[PDB]
Write a protein that binds this ligand. Sequence first.
Ligand SMILES: [K+]
Ligand SMILES: [Mg+2]
Ligand SMILES: [Mg+2]
Ligand SMILES: [Mg+2]
Ligand SMILES: [Mg+2]
Ligand SMILES: [Mg+2]
Ligand SMILES: [Mg+2]
Ligand SMILES: [Mg+2]
Ligand SMILES: [Mg+2]
Ligand SMILES: [Mg+2]
Ligand SMILES: [Mg+2]
Ligand SMILES: [Mg+2]
Ligand SMILES: [Mg+2]
Ligand SMILES: [Mg+2]
Lengths: 158, 353, 52, 98, 191
Amino acid sequence: AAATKVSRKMFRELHGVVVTSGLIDKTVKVRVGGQKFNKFLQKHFDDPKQYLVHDPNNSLRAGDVVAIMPGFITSKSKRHVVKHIIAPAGTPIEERPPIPSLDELWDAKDAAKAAKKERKVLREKMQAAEEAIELAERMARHAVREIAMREKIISLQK
Amino acid sequence: TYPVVSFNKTSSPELKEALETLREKVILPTYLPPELRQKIFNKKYEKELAHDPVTIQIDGQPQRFSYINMLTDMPNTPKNIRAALLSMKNGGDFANLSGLLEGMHRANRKLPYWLSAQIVRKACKAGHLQLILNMVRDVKRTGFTLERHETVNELLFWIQRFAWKSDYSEPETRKALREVQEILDALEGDERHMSKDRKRQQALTRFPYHRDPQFLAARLNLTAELAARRATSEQQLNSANDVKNLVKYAEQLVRLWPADKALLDMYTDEAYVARVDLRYLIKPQVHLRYASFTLQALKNAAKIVGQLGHGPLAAQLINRAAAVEAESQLAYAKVDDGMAGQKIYEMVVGGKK
Amino acid sequence: SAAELAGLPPKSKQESWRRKMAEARRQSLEAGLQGLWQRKVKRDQKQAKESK
Amino acid sequence: VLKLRLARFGRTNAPFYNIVVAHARTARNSKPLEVIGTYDPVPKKDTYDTTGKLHKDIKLDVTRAKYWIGVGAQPTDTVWRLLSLVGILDPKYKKPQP
Amino acid sequence: LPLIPKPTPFVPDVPTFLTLIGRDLKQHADKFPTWEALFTLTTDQLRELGVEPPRARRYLLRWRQRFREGKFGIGGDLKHVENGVAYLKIHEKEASPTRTSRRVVNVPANQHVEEVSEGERVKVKGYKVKGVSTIVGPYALPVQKGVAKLAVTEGMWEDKRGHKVDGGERRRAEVRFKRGVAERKALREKM
RNA sequence: GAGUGCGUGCAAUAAGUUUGCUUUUCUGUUAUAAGUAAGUAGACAUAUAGGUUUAGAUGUUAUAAUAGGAUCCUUCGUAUG
RNA sequence: GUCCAAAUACUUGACACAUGCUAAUCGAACGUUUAAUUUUGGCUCUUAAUUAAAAGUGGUGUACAGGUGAGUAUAAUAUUUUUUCGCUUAACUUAAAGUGAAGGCAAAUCCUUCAUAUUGCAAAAGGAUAUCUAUAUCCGCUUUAAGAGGAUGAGAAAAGUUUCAGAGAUAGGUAGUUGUUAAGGUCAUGGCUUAACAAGCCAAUAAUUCUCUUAGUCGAAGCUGAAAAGGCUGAUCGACCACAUUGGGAAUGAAAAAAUCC
Ligand SMILES: [K+]
Ligand SMILES: [Mg+2]
Ligand SMILES: [Mg+2]
Ligand SMILES: [Mg+2]
Ligand SMILES: [Mg+2]
Ligand SMILES: [Mg+2]
Ligand SMILES: [Mg+2]
Ligand SMILES: [Mg+2]
Ligand SMILES: [Mg+2]
Ligand SMILES: [Mg+2]
Ligand SMILES: [Mg+2]
Ligand SMILES: [Mg+2]
Ligand SMILES: [Mg+2]
Ligand SMILES: [Mg+2]
């Protein structure tokens, strides 16, 4: 009810080639294919694009064919995630750390986000109790004077 | 709009001392704008004011305003008014109350609720009734509202006494009856005399001031003193006309005034408890003061109304008089010898003189 | 209005006018929404029918 | 403030109006949000009719005008008079009977 | 079709009507030979007589249609009028043993309020009692304590047309400045 | 040689303006102090009277802390050279 | 060169302008003054009012309408399609609750502040008209919950779209800039923000930056061709942008969207 769950929606799968790796942690540059239509010449032109794909366990080396998927937002300039390795490069797939399934990556977000809300509801309550105590403490010093001053008058009417 | 308050007539030197103190520290500063008025009462601007004190174009001559310690330099307004009030034994002296109460009204000084009744007593016993009615008429400036129930009972008392002093002469009685109606019309119509305190006193008495039997009885007194003289065509028309008002008012007072109920029982029993409203009546010295004219009115009123052939009213009015006279006689046996109440009642009802 | 759901008469001349105008806007919105809803349904059916 | 008003069109001495739903503080003939209908003030006469009667042609989308009236649209004095005849609103003015 | 309303005591004739509505319409008081000609003539007929500009003709037709509907101006519901002068008086009552209801009624100048019957005293609309013996209301000059009169004045019922102080909101600073310049020059010349 | 509604650097600069080891001041609570001014609460007494007296619970005044908004200086800054 | 109707009419010097006019309105917000009228008081002066005019304080509107094309060279936090959304104290519809107490100016529905409004922070304004032998209405004000509208948040995700004036030179640009871990923030996403590490990200054929010249942009809007993602224009019509002598600026307000203001 109070926890927001990720979309967990599947998108298209693209086949590309890892152009760079080992430069930044958990990130690789993959080159995918495309085709842009020119309306003036009535001709299709190859429009390849290079994105920053999210590599969770750093299991990709520059030169291997991989399958990526969009819609997995991880950073400002990253919106793709690795699905699996088509053809490895250098070493077999069995000699690299496994690629987590999208379920494992999505569950990490839900768990990580859910725990974040747990801290807010806790810090919020502490801030309210830490403030209500200081507010009720003023009533003590304010009510003791009134009761001490209001009882002085009542006692003088008996 | 109005001219600045000023005092230029003082017989005794003590009187001037009390007025000049308030005028230069409680009334004159009010004529300054809200900006400058906050500088006089500031310690941060004390050094500056000493060099270039504030000035105002009053009557051409530039006034002056230096630093004034709000806690020490400021005078006691109640005491100063009392001192100034007691030091008033001349016509020109009492003429300063119009300016004094005006400045106090500008300074938003909440004066004692009983102050209005005190000014009316001392000022009227010296022959300055007009100076009072002038303030009551000029309430938009002097702030002399008829808030207290006593102030209305104290003022109407003197109005009747001034006429009674000269054996109810027609020239003055005609003028005295105008002043009474001038008040009853002001309490109802004029809204300056309506305040929170008056709303509480009216709720306890269940009668508005303009319909209170204690006050209406004053209008019935002077009226009964007009038909008694005559009852020359121009003058004969007024006499015959006054006979209609008598039966009109006499028939209105009997309706409001319950049956066999004296002065201390007219209002609810919860009004005589609080001292801030309707408690002076308890003291016999004050009861006989306001129970003399109201009593003599019913007697003289029941008489005339009886000659015209009004049986019911004759028995009705005599019922109240008998109830007030009995209660009045009781208070006459407890008042201390020498008090004002014992003297007034002894001279009005007793007729010793 | 609470004064209308209790079956009370209008307070003054203006109260009656507001009661009538409010109803005119109440009935107009019902006939407008339902009327415009049938247009869409009748329009979507035609497209799907012809597109099929 | 949504208003149902008439946008005047036509030529000189030939007025033709356009019932529209536009914002109050906008040009009279600016492109509105919608066009509910049209209005011709000059009354016409049936072609093969010699009785002498006259009528006025008015195209109006009642279903669309009702919704806008139900959400707070304020029709002008003239459009209000037309909607009264249709029966959507009550007459704002009436001929004194006395 | 063109119904004509009966003349009321406050507006007996045409010269009185055209005077109340002001706007300098009392010029054409002679064009209308009778009271029945005012409410009968049409727009085109009033244009031939000389009722102009169009603002005056359209304004007169408005107060004309406003008179048929009994939508009189101020002091139109009066009944006891004498030579264009009415008299208001206060009628006191007893709504309760502690209250008093005062109503500004219209009765003859000589007769007294209480002497008049219930049906003869008429409460004029737009006039109330502020206090106990004061009559408040437009064009109510005081005659005595609790008595006021209504004199038929020009523009009594007119709808005042707006005016510009010194050229309105746009051309205001320009007007004042020039006027000031002329005054200073004259004072310098005088000295 | 003459001119220049252009770009730009430096100096200068009105309105306006970042910042605060700038200078004044107002407001807000918080904690105190006073009760001589204003008040607001009582306690006694007097009588053509309405006086004496204590009190801070709202509130007024003062100090301190603290938050915020206005002013002065500062920085930037048209014209101008 | 006879007549009538409709529609167009400074395309150039955004050159300078005599005169009259284009934004005012509410007295049922408010008192101030001057006139008579009627009341006081004291013997013309001096109170308290009523009435009518004449200048003002306030509220709303001048943020709409209308005019012009000087400047302006564009890919942008621009734009459609589907999924998911967020904000909105003025005005417009529907309803509920509350509309009390002081001070400042001559007075106020103007300023300042208080009490009350789930728990705690947080509001308001009064004016006017009837009835009877005080009560009940009317027009407003404050708050809250919705509809509508909106010029709204950088909304976001996926897949697309955008003929970017002409000529010349320029190979680096980017520093929260790119990513990781942790935390905060957000309906949500995003260095959006912060701390500590890593040296990355974009581009190489001009990304980026610069000078010159020219121009308001667009539409079957006008003209034209048989036709082309046709060509040209960018008057009248509609949408958008900019400006109001030139240059430099801020505040008010729900929102600058002014022929305002400095
Ligand atoms: K031009
Ligand atoms: Mg190919
Ligand atoms: Mg420099
Ligand atoms: Mg400098
Ligand atoms: Mg003291
Ligand atoms: Mg320095
Ligand atoms: Mg320069
Ligand atoms: Mg505009
Ligand atoms: Mg154009
Ligand atoms: Mg109130
Ligand atoms: Mg798709
Ligand atoms: Mg950034
Ligand atoms: Mg140009
Ligand atoms: Mg241009």
